[PDB]
């Protein structure tokens, strides 16, 4: 295979273009369109959407009904179609066209020298600044064919254009106002199989209108588990009563892939790589989406599927797509902040309800001065505060084997702190057994002690292990740190933990003295030896748990995010010496460890998991929630996929 | 309320009657029917189904077409209807009736002085000994009304009769051949809401025909989650070319509630209490049943619902129903044997797969000489045998605290046996924690009990890490149910629990099964026998009672008072009903309502509220019983932080003190 | 006339409530609901929406299938209905209810002593943290009636509740997941006449989920030219595998009227005055909205319209609504800057 190719990893490259309108002059419009389409070709784009009524200009009013204008529009269309024989992408260009008795506001789907379909606008606004019914007929419920340059081509609202060599790409087109009505044509189309929803728009600009466009294109892409590709008219449209801003944008399942400069001087394009596998994966999992389809069966099976062969470029054309290094840790500081706020409150209110139900037992927790146990202590304290419980009911324990951060924190917090040396009990145990086992004896004895103390002192044992450890099965199962009465950290991956700790510092709700210890814990604490860097395994975890992406897809993504430390963004808090870059060889190596550990070795540990709250939209690993899987399965096929598909280095 | 009333607990009493046919003489047939219906009334029955063509006789052939015969049938029907004003049950009686152009083979649904509906047979056999098309029209797709004694009453295949004061009781009727076709009218009816399916039959008898009747009545009751009430013609029918056996039977979701003597001299009835709550519960849970309905929406919403008010007797009328003392342990020896065979093989193959997947680790198991650990050791041994593994790869441990059966068994089996005294480690731990026992006081704490229980598991896990094995869990389903186990570090935890789905009441019977089969030598049998003979009930109650409650709750979700009614009918009287094999006369206790109530309170509290967090983090192991297992990944998804207040309150308000 | 009265100016006062869940204990939930409903009465609210499965708790899983739970839910419902004889607002309260073969996830529309309708959730998520199909039947395409306390009342996804003395207030109800599918029930309902769209939600909370809820409630209120009234579950729901944030919000044609504190200690309400005339005016003008209706004529005329008389308070009850002094000049500096 050809591993650096975005197309071979399930991306499809799409473009939303805003050209230079010359109102009333189709040849000029077509020349601008042709020139932008050639650019899109050069970029390896599979799709290029233009503004509403591209070929005539949207704003020319009764000029639309002039014979010479309609004649010139047809002549220009035919030239485009002919030029398109040498162009990679499907071009979606607007045109007022004659059909039966009237002119329809249409989008003309053009590919490799042929017209694939012609789609009329369904809803024609005739209110405020809009007069569309005056010149143009509604397309809703038109079917059949239309005659364009000596061919009969599909015509109507019910069309789907499907790439026969790229099944994740199924195109539907609507027009401007179409997406603003309670039941848009695009929403039935997605149910029928459309994955990429195009919109050609005129859209005179107005205070707050760009927000309206966004609210609707974004919600559409989210509700319809689709890419939404949008292109509005700019410079050149008539300013007799209106102004135009040239806005273009591309959305994917709620997320902005790209957008262009508003009120540009000159033409602009948004170009992005859409992840069809992401959309595929979201739909596979959200059954209620298919349920909705079945419920509108007749509405949804009546669409007509026009096939074409894209034949996209096979080689390296980069990845026009932002890939976060930390799926669980947003690089944008406003967002990271929001996430931390939510994580923390989730953890706390999860624990509060447990305590309420147990009529407020004491909280037993082993504190080692490590990141996980520190954060848990803080979570426990806040829980107890919010529930009006004395902090002295939290029973913290240092359990030395064979750090001072731990006693310092407990003391600053004002919980009950205690030390218990497990060493002698360990020796006694090691000897009685005739002695990994030696590490497990200590790990087990810690949990054993904590559970017995909890029995004795009327408390529950707080679990401490994080989601990343659950994922790799990095924990001692049974009698060991895997086991507890309630685990507040179970849904928090390791990459996010350090950020919650800062959040709690930065907010400063626990005094200045507490913050200093916490700061110390951080500075001191920053395993990865045998299971690899958690930044890489948390990356893989998100891809697998959310999308079920195959290993080579995960390696491609991780490599685009991580191979170059100067590229992309780092969340806040990474001084310049903590900004590693990973080679493909490293990413491959750790991925092998990951799939082996995650699919095969580690499930039985998750299988018997104490209670605790889901935190990340990426998923948690509860066998009672997000991850139902066998404890007795090999990972052969994943390892084999990495062998066959991911280059050695 | 009125606790000893079967109606107030959701039962409906149904009857399948076989009368005395007098062919060609409707007055006589009606007199027989009237007499049987009065008996049914006396019995508090809500329903009485008679044989096909009751009023004329099924076998009279072209005599069905005679005006005087048809006129007499009508006259007789109207007298029944009038007599029925004083009768409790809905009577379903057969009659050849004129409608439009022809006579239809009908069942006339009759209640408290009115005709509720008339239902024509849908499929009329005209082959081998059957000539029904010659005299009678098919009913399939007839609708509308028909005129019976100056009233227009519903007519057709699409009727449902619903008790307005007893919503679990929704009656559908079909006729004989109707239940034998690939898509019977009764199957669309059950989808539409019918819960009790009636069948009036003529059914000349033939070698092997009673089996056919049962195969189809039983499978119908099972596939349609319903009661199926069936009545065939008997003595009196013409023996010109045929004989008749008078068979009657009542099925409920695949189970025979009642049947009557074949070839009786005289009339016979099958009378049984149908549990509408059981049918309700099965349907609530099997969503694919509702799914089937929605897929045949148009077919299923077109039924017409005729209402009637039953107004059943409110008092004590007994319970015409067999209630097993041991929902998990069948009293019938053939059946118990089948169950044991299956339980055992399930346990074993469950463990074999785990071992295969772990590339054959050693098996570490704590053996205390108790029932659970004994049975597990056996299970382990068989697993190893079938996988061609040396028995010396099973590592059994006695773990004495502060029995010889245990070392005897391990030794006879030939596994690796070893003792480890956990007492010193325990002392060291009790002292390290500052427990009063370490300075002398006899504080037989729970902490003190848990230190030992915990240390056992801790040891076993460490040995497992050391010696390359997995720890076999040992706790049984009944202990999972009551949260009777030490959670976390303790006997609740393990790498694979083969006993997790086996309730305690069944364990002793698996041990005998293994003895009785004798596949492990005579020496092994003797120790096992010893374990039995040699082998807490005081804090959680008798497991026979808690296992009974467990089944009701886990399978059906029945409310506490319903469970108490059932347990009391099963258990209050030791001479009543049957005991599985293996209960000598002094192990046959009876329980009072006061006891059953008392333990039920303990059960709902422990099961709905306290114990769930223990189940919530449960090691892998196989489901065994059709009653269910308690894996939070399978049969039982519930909250760890919920109170049982409403169940306790229901017991207070509904179940008498004693 | 009576000029200082919000109702006489075309407003209708609506409330989205988050109560205290006591899982498995319907009497307790109902007591909390009753108490919040009385508050809403006192505020002159016409409408009070509660969280999904209010009476039982959304999170109780197979406990939904327990007879004693379902029995208690019914008893509790009947007491609310009876208490509601003296309450001004239409209460919309969640309840698992038995119908035909199964239990449906329902919202019970209650008003002045009677049940107006019962609406089942249409889309039951069974993925990730959701297992709803295990215990509950889909409501899409259910019609007819259901028996609640000796009455046969409208049942199904196709219901509209219309105030006969306040025509700008036409209520439709959906549930949680209903609003997340490409073609939600609420969108057809708005085309059919619904102006106020209620949503009862359980909605375990998760990083970024509150954004999702907003994106979809806000876009719905905008695309459907309607108020969208939304109430999620809070404290008391089981934290076996999930946490809850108690979020409540009220949208109007894309604009946030009100919202409540996330992860509150105690119960919270969003209360706002919805301008029915504003909705009325937007619809009069955007012909393409009616055009959409006509295009789905058969879909949209099949709704059933249940009438009730609100009889709202006639006097001065203030105006629970922010009115900018400068319709053309936003007071929020970020926004004014954008403009
Ligand atoms: N598929 C399966 N089904 C049922 N049981 C299975 C099993 N696979 C192994 N087992 C059993 O499980 C045991 C192996 O698992 P386990 O006992 O947990 O031990 P294991 O994962 O092999 O070792 C734990 C490792 O994690 C490290 N550790 C320890 C403590 C804390 C942390 C931390 O960072 O928080 C890390 C420590 O360095 C140690 O090397 C064996 O007894 C094996 O027989
Ligand atoms: N909802 C919840 N979520 C998280 N944690 C919860 C909890 N509820 C209690 N806990 C905690 O769990 C602990 C209570 O459970 P646990 O530690 O197991 O102990 P617990 O259930 O209090 O006692 C176990 C009892 O079972 C009997 N037992 C034990 C072992 C074996 C056998 C046998 O013969 O089969 C019988 C023994 O007599 C003992 O009294 C306490 O620390 C409590 O605070
Ligand atoms: N010395 C200790 N004293 C008290 N508790 C401990 C001690 N060591 C481990 N624990 C308990 O067991 C858990 C797991 O141990 P582990 O050594 O993985 O934790 P850590 O020190 O937070 O991380 P790391 O090993 O990566 O520095 C801890 O979070 C803590 O609750
Ligand atoms: N003395 C013991 N020696 C070895 N293992 C033990 C011992 N006591 C308990 N165990 C282990 O822990 C499990 C639970 O112990 P428990 O004493 O409850 O079992 P039991 O004796 O079968 O039960 P019961 O006391 O009700 O007969 C045992 O089945 C076994 O795995």
UniProtKB/Swiss-Prot annotation, chain A:
MF terms in GO = ATP binding; glutaminase activity; NAD+ synthase (glutamine-hydrolyzing) activity; NAD+ synthase activity
Q: Which residues form the CN hydrolase domain?
A: 12-276
Which InterPro entries does the protein's record reference? Answer: C-N_Hydrolase, C-N_Hydrolase_sf, Gln-dep_NAD_synthase, NAD+_synth_C, NAD/GMP_synthase, NAD_synthase, Rossmann-like_a/b/a_fold
Give the keywords, sorted.
ATP-binding, Ligase, NAD, Nucleotide-binding
- Catalytic activity line of the entry: deamido-NAD(+) + L-glutamine + ATP + H2O = L-glutamate + AMP + diphosphate + NAD(+) + H(+)
Q: Does Ligase appear among the keywords?
A: yes
Q: Where does ATP bind?
A: 366-373, 464
Q: Which GO terms describe its biological process?
A: NAD biosynthetic process
Biological function: Catalyzes the ATP-dependent amidation of deamido-NAD to form NAD. Uses L-glutamine as a nitrogen source.
Task: Indicate the family of this protein.
Answer: In the C-terminal section; belongs to the NAD synthetase family.
* Protein name, per record: Glutamine-dependent NAD(+) synthetase
Q: Which organism is it from?
A: Mycobacterium tuberculosis (strain CDC 1551 / Oshkosh)
Swiss-Prot record, chain B:
Q: Does the keyword Nucleotide-binding apply?
A: yes
Output the GO biological process annotations, alphabetical, semicolon-separated: NAD biosynthetic process
Query: Which is a Gene Ontology cellular component entry for this protein?
Result: cytoplasm
Give TM regions.
none
- Residues that coordinate or bind L-glutamine: 127, 203, 209
Pathway the protein takes part in:
Cofactor biosynthesis; NAD(+) biosynthesis; NAD(+) from deamido-NAD(+) (L-Gln route): step 1/1
Catalysed reaction, written as an equation: deamido-NAD(+) + L-glutamine + ATP + H2O = L-glutamate + AMP + diphosphate + NAD(+) + H(+)
Q: A single Gene Ontology molecular function, please?
A: NAD+ synthase activity
Q: Its domain of life?
A: Bacteria
Q: Quick one: which residues bind deamido-NAD(+)? A: 450, 479, 484-487, 614
In the UniProt record, does the keyword Ligase occur? yes
Q: List UniProt keywords, sorted A-Z.
A: ATP-binding, Ligase, NAD, Nucleotide-binding
**Segments of this protein annotated with the region Disordered:** 618-637
Region entry Ligase: which residue ranges? 337-658
Q: Which HAMAP family does the record cross-reference, listed alphabetically?
A: NadE_glutamine_dep
Say what the protein does: Catalyzes the ATP-dependent amidation of deamido-NAD to form NAD. Uses L-glutamine as a nitrogen source.
In the record, the note on similarity to other proteins reads:
In the C-terminal section; belongs to the NAD synthetase family.
Designated name of the protein: Glutamine-dependent NAD(+) synthetase
Lineage in the entry? Bacteria, Bacillati, Actinomycetota, Actinomycetes, Mycobacteriales
């Amino acid at each position: 295979m050809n591993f650096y190719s975005a197309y071979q990893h399930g991306f499809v490259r799409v473009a939303a273009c805003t050209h230079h309108t010359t109102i009333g002059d189709p040849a000029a419009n077509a020349a601008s369109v042709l020139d932008m389409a050639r650019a899109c070709h050069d970029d390896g784009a599979a799709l290029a959407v233009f503004p509403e009524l591209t070929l005539s200009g949207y704003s020319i009013e009764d000029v639309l009904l002039q014979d010479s204008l309609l004649d010139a529009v047809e002549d220009a269309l035919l030239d485009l179609v002919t030029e398109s024989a040498d162009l990679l992408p499907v071009l979606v260009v607007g045109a007022p066209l004659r059909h039966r008795h009237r002119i329809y506001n249409t989008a003309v789907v053009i590919h490799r020298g042929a017209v694939l379909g012609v789609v009329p606008k369904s809803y024609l606004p005739t209110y405020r600044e809009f007069y569309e019914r005056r010149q143009m007929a509604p397309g809703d419920g038109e079917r059949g064919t239309i005659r364009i340059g000596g061919a009969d081509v599909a015509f109507g609202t019910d069309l789907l254009f499907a790439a026969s060599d790229l099944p994740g790409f199924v195109l539907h087109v609507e027009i401007a106002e179409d997406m603003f009505v309670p039941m848009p044509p695009s929403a039935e189309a997605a149910l029928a199989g459309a994955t990429v929803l195009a919109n050609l728009s005129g859209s005179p600009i107005t205070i707050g209108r760009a927000e309206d466009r966004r609210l609707l294109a974004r919600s559409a892409s989210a509700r319809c588990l689709a890419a939404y590709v949008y292109a509005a008219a700019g410079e050149g449209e008539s300013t007799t009563d209106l102004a135009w801003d040239g806005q273009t944008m591309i959305w994917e399942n709620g997320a902005l892939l790209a957008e262009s400069e508003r009120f540009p001087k000159g033409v602009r394009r948004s170009v992005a790589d859409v992840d069809t596998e992401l959309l595929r994966s979201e739909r596979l999992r959200m059954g209620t989406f298919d349920d909705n389809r079945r419920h509108h069966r007749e509405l949804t099976e009546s669409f007509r599927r026009i096939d074409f062969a894209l034949d996209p470029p096979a080689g390296d054309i980069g990845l026009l797509r932002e890939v976060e290094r930390f799926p669980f840790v947003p690089a944008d500081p406003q967002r990271l902040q929001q996430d931390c706020y939510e994580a923390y409150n989730i953890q706390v209110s999860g624990l509060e309800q447990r305590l309420r139900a147990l009529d407020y037992p004491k909280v037993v927790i082993g504190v080692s001065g490590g990141l996980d146990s520190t954060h848990a202590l803080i979570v426990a304290t806040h829980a107890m505060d919010r529930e009006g419980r004395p902090r002295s009911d939290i029973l913290a324990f240092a359990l030395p084997g064979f750090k001072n951060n731990a006693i310092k924190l407990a003391r600053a917090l004002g919980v009950t702190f205690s030390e218990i040396d497990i060493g002698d009990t360990a020796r006694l145990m090691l000897h009685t057994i005739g002695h990994v086992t030696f590490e497990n004896v200590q790990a087990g004895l810690r949990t054993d002690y904590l559970f017995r103390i909890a029995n004795q002192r009327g408390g529950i044992v707080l679990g401490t292990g994080d989601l990343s450890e659950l994922a790799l099965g990095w924990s001692t199962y049974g009698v060991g740190d895997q086991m507890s009465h309630y685990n507040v950290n179970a849904g928090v991956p390791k990459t996010l933990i350090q950020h919650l700790i800062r959040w709690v510092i930065s907010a400063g709700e626990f005094g200045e003295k507490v913050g200093e210890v916490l700061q110390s814990v951080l500075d001191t604490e920053i395993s990865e030896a045998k299971v690899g860097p958690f930044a890489l395994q948390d990356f893989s975890l998100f891809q697998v748990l959310r999308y079920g992406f195959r290993p080579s897809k995960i390696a491609f993504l991780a490599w685009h995010a991580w191979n170059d430390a100067e590229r992309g963004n780092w969340p806040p808090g990474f001084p310049k010496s903590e900004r590693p870059s990973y080679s493909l060889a490293e990413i491959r190596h750790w991925l092998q460890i990951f799939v082996q550990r995650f699919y095969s070795f580690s499930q039985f540990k998750r299988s018997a998991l104490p209670n605790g709250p889901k935190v990340s939209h990426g998923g948690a690993l509860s066998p009672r929630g997000d991850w139902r899987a066998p404890s007795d399965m090999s990972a052969r096929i994943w390892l084999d996929q990495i062998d066959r598909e991911v280059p050695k280095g």
